[PDB]
Amino acid sequence: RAESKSFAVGMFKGQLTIDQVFPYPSVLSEEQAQFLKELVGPVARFFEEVNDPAKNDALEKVEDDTLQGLKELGAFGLQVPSELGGLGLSNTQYARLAEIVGMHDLGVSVTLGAHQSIGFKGILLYGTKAQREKYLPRVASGQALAAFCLTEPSSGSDVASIRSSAIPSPCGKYYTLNGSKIWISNGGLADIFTVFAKTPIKDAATGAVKEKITAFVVERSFGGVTHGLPEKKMGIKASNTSEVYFDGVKVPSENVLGEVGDGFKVAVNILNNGRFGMAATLAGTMKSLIAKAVDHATNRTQFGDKIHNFGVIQEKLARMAILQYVTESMAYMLSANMDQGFKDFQIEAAISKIFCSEAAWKVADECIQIMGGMGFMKEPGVERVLRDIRIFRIFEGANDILRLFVALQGCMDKGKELTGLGNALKNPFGNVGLLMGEAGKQLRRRTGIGSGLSLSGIVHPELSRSGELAVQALDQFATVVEAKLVKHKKGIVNEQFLLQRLADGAIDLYAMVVVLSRASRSLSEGYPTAQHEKMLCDSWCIEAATRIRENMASLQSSPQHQELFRNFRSISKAMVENGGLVTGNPLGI
Amino acid sequence: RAESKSFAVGMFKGQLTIDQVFPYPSVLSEEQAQFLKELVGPVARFFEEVNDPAKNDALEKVEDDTLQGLKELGAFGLQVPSELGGLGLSNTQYARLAEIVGMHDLGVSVTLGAHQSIGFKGILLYGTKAQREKYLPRVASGQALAAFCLTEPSSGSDVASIRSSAIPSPCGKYYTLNGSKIWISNGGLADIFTVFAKTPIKDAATGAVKEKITAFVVERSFGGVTHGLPEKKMGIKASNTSEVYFDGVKVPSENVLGEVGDGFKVAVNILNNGRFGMAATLAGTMKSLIAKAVDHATNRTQFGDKIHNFGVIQEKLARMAILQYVTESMAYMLSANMDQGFKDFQIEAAISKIFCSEAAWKVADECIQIMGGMGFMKEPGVERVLRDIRIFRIFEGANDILRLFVALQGCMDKGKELTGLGNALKNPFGNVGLLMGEAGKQLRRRTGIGSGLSLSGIVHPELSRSGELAVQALDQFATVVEAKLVKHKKGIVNEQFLLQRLADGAIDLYAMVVVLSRASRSLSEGYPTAQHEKMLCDSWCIEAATRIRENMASLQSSPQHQELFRNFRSISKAMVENGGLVTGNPLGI
Numbered sequence A, B: 001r002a003e004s005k006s007f008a009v010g011m012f013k014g015q016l017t018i019d020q021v022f023p024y025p026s027v028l029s030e031e032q033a034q035f036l037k038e039l040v041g042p043v044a045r046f047f048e049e050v051n052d053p054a055k056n057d058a059l060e061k062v063e064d065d066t067l068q069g070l071k072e073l074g075a076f077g078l079q080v081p082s083e084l085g086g087l088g089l090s091n092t093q094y095a096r097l098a099e100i101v102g103m104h105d106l107g108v109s110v111t112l113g114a115h116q117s118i119g120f121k122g123i124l125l126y127g128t129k130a131q132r133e134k135y136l137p138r139v140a141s142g143q144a145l146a147a148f149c150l151t152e153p154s155s156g157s158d159v160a161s162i163r164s165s166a167i168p169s170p171c172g173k174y175y176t177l178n179g180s181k182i183w184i185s186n187g188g189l190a191d192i193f194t195v196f197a198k199t200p201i202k203d204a205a206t207g208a209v210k211e212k213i214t215a216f217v218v219e220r221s222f223g224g225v226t227h228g229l230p231e232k233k234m235g236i237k238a239s240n241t242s243e244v245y246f247d248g249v250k251v252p253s254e255n256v257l258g259e260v261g262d263g264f265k266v267a268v269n270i271l272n273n274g275r276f277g278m279a280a281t282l283a284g285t286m287k288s289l290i291a292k293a294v295d296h297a298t299n300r301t302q303f304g305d306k307i308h309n310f311g312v313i314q315e316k317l318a319r320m321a322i323l324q325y326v327t328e329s330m331a332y333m334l335s336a337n338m339d340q341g342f343k344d345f346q347i348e349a350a351i352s353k354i355f356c357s358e359a360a361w362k363v364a365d366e367c368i369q370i371m372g373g374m375g376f377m378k379e380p381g382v383e384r385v386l387r388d389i390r391i392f393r394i395f396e397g398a399n400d401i402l403r404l405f406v407a408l409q410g411c412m413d414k415g416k417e418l419t420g421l422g423n424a425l426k427n428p429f430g431n432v433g434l435l436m437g438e439a440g441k442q443l444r445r446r447t448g449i450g451s452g453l454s455l456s457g458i459v460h461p462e463l464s465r466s467g468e469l470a471v472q473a474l475d476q477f478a479t480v481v482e483a484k485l486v487k488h489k490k491g492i493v494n495e496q497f498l499l500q501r502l503a504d505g506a507i508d509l510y511a512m513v514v515v516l517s518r519a520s521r522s523l524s525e526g527y528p529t530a531q532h533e534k535m536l537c538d539s540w541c542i543e544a545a546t547r548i549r550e551n552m553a554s555l556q557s558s559p560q561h562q563e564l565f566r567n568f569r570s571i572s573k574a575m576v577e578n579g580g581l582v583t584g585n586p587l588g589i
């Protein structure tokens, strides 16, 4: 059975599946690129002639007749098959536009994000020809917007808990649908509500019924769909976002999307098929933060000098730069992997969401800090974009959950190979090649040889110094997984403190290797910036190898860290019991 | 000459001047306390019956007739001599009220902060009897507000650059004053503008003139003072904040405050005499964040459970708790040191500002993260208090500057003792006791003895485990200073990258020892929470000893860190040259 092409999955097994990762990918046909040249121009000039971010914020919705203009560029159909009404773009052409719009206004660009990153996305990802023909030409025009109605009060971050749910009619010719969904994008505006809901089914093991989760397409034309007024939120304000209510809505059963009960797989497939766009948009946003910053820090005097001459400004600026270049270099790589058409990349997707969402927030905060008083005002716009970033660590799955998902979904196949232990011990002689070099891991790991991994020939020689770091990290990272997995078995899923820290380890490690790949590309092709990219990549790899070391080491052994986890359980418990901070002030009064 | 009682100054010399720090201080007379008990009640109940934070934000000023009510409690005169119209409070009684108001609305409480933490503060800290009698009874009533008009466009965070400046009249009977000041609190409302400006003086070495900096008191009753409309800012919005302009304002010369040219010392004295209030207010704010947090995390289900049962929630909550308890335990300690009346504590002051301002922001961000979607809305208020915190890392001196100040002002006296080297080598025999145990440092440090430091008897025995950590940290921290100081001499002031990291080291180390002191108090007196405080203190000390290790070690030796600092200088330079992010996207387009 073929090895999972996922680099991260390989990395959990301590294997080195570079092949989704090297050379840093290129995917454009010469027409696909050339087409892109013709699109970049007018769209970006739109976002200086036409748009106005501050006014968009003030109105708490898009400029309606500026929004309209996007319909005419087909902005609501960028990924649709061209003759069915779209631009037919590959993932990576689309991602470039996502970078552009992310440079300018998160609000509009996330209204799109809802509408086309995930909104109708099921119609492409499973819809039949009849489904596409019916709905898609409407949606692509942006005459009809769509929304991904997962979340409801009871619980949103656990899909299995959704109580909003649906009765097949007795003639079977339609499903019937009920429930609230809360915080749905374009809930005021959309026509094509995708809705995810529970439904009974007669089972295929006994003919008893069980309850399973289904995804659906619902036009507001059905009647009985209704939505609240918009909520008030920290930013993104030009985006419409509301509840949606279902008055027993009827749904002709050929509007089952995918197949009844496949819905949960659909939901995770859509969200993973969308996440790359977020990293693209934040890449753009960061590009415009860092520009705004360096310009201010170019002009401001202090202490008789331009402040960019002072070390702490240089460090802040360099970090923000590295974070942008990493995010960009990851986003384009995931889009390219999809356009090539690898099928498995679930971890890389989740990692890209986590890293881009947190890193943009780090950058924007530093930006305000360098910008000082100037920065804090409503005039310079940085303030709005900061407020707008903080949302991204939450929606489209909160990063804490996504961390746990990364770690668990990762160490599925490690668990498989450990099961390979129990199998092989019970066929040592009949089977051949059963464990050849498997204990060799300990031959490598106990006696302190090189593990046998290298980036030789894989990375441009000059980088290989920093490239060496990745091997070190990898050897250390995969090592701890084995131990901490084995000790805890499938009980691991309750070792949350540990799982989180493995999530952060995986994040930094994969972020490392991505940049090291792109750097190798730019070095070899010799673009004039290639030495600059070398300098960035090296700085990142040095820091990331440091953090990974102190994570892995502090996690593997320290009794004091077990004292910490004990303390956190104790202290959290005490806070919960008291329902508050336990201790009075030193005065008692 | 007496040893500086400053613990931090001692710490720079690697000495252990616990005596400003142990036992954890108590300062209240039984009337001072009892008075406080009578004040806590009605004020806090005011901040539930009367105030409304959301409306305050909406109006972008205080509820005018709610503001009025504070005048009647004397809120604008809490520190004024009672018979001159104040409450006569010690620092620590005032600090308790600061904790209360910080629990509820940063806006009002910083309008006070401007008015009385620093505003009139020069009138107490140097004003003559005639000055106090004249101005103070007006100000204490809050009929007249006051402002600390340091900052102006040209430059604000460097006091020496202020161009706003003043001519002594030829009769000498008044000074005459000119310039703008920008971002001045209560600039719309205040009557008693303190203003800080340059002025010529005939020198006392030749009778040639030089230019020096003076502080002044200015009533708007003088005429010729004017101010802009209010600016728009991310929060705190109920605070008024504006420019102020000076139309050649005349100032009768007995309104020199302190003495002409002493102004810069006055400015730093005021700001240091104020900073403790900020740590108090944020302590309160954090107390109400963490309460809001634990309550939401007490009720929310997910995955079939209350989420507080899941490890990552427990860790977040425990950290937020530790950060609150540290901030509180520091603020009250600085206030107590002032009420006792130690004179030198400049570093502890700056540290308290840095740590409280950053730590509250860490807490508020985690609070939003646990609060998820619920958290992001305008309904629960957390979003406003988050926006309101981000300002504190900037104003009253930006933390980056304050870091550099901490490190430099610290290693002044180390430089003195190294000069003691050059002196002693040129009197080895005449002088006695010249260097006895001084090379003993290397006897201790090379051969790896204990340095001779301990907390034995100083800290409660059970803590001494975590107490041991401080000695380790201290030995490591002071060690690097010596080396990095010596190598760089007074050129050190240009080794910014290094100085910053020493600032962070000092921060964590002193924060540790503070909590270890308070914990020892609570243990010995045996308050029912004392085991809880033990658990907090231990967790903090373990983490802080870890971060200090990796700071000191990574800074002292790694060539790769010198490669980093090289890279940052190179990369920052490239960004400045290009005035932007250097590299195109992987597509070139």
Ligand SMILES: Cc1cc2nc3c(=O)[nH]c(=O)nc-3n(C[C@H](O)[C@H](O)[C@H](O)COP(=O)(O)OP(=O)(O)OC[C@H]3O[C@@H](n4cnc5c(N)ncnc54)[C@H](O)[C@@H]3O)c2cc1C
Residues within 6 Å of the ligand: A300, A301, A302, A303, A307, A310, A311, A312, A313, A369, A370, A371, A372, A373, A374, A376, B114, B148, B149, B150, B151, B155, B156, B157, B182, B183, B184, B185, B233, B236, B241, B391, B394, B395, B396, B397, B398, B400, B401, B404
């Ligand atoms: C709501 C609000 C209220 C305010 N109220 C007051 C008030 O009551 N009184 C008052 O005096 N001010 C007030 N201010 C102004 C605020 O305190 C200013 O940030 C500060 O006083 C001066 O900062 P600046 O912007 O002039 O610094 P800048 O000149 O803009 O420089 C600060 C930035 O440059 C960098 N920098 C500058 N010099 C150095 C150096 N030597 N080394 C390294 N980095 C350096 C820092 O990293 C920082 O990012 C207020 C501001 C706001 C937003």
Ligand SMILES: Cc1cc2nc3c(=O)[nH]c(=O)nc-3n(C[C@H](O)[C@H](O)[C@H](O)COP(=O)(O)OP(=O)(O)OC[C@H]3O[C@@H](n4cnc5c(N)ncnc54)[C@H](O)[C@@H]3O)c2cc1C
Residues within 6 Å of the ligand: A114, A147, A148, A149, A150, A151, A155, A156, A157, A182, A183, A184, A185, A233, A236, A241, A391, A394, A395, A396, A397, A398, A400, A401, B300, B301, B302, B303, B307, B310, B311, B312, B313, B369, B370, B371, B372, B373, B374, B376
């Ligand atoms: C502006 C905006 C737009 C939105 N648009 C959409 C949209 O288009 N589509 C959509 O589906 N949703 C949307 N949402 C909702 C958002 O995606 C939700 O945050 C998410 O869908 C579900 O989160 P929740 O609040 O229900 O999670 P909750 O049930 O509130 O739980 C999340 C919190 O609980 C903790 N937690 C939960 N489970 C665990 C666990 N197992 N272990 C440890 N900790 C745990 C986490 O630490 C986190 O802090 C939007 C929200 C906003 C604010």
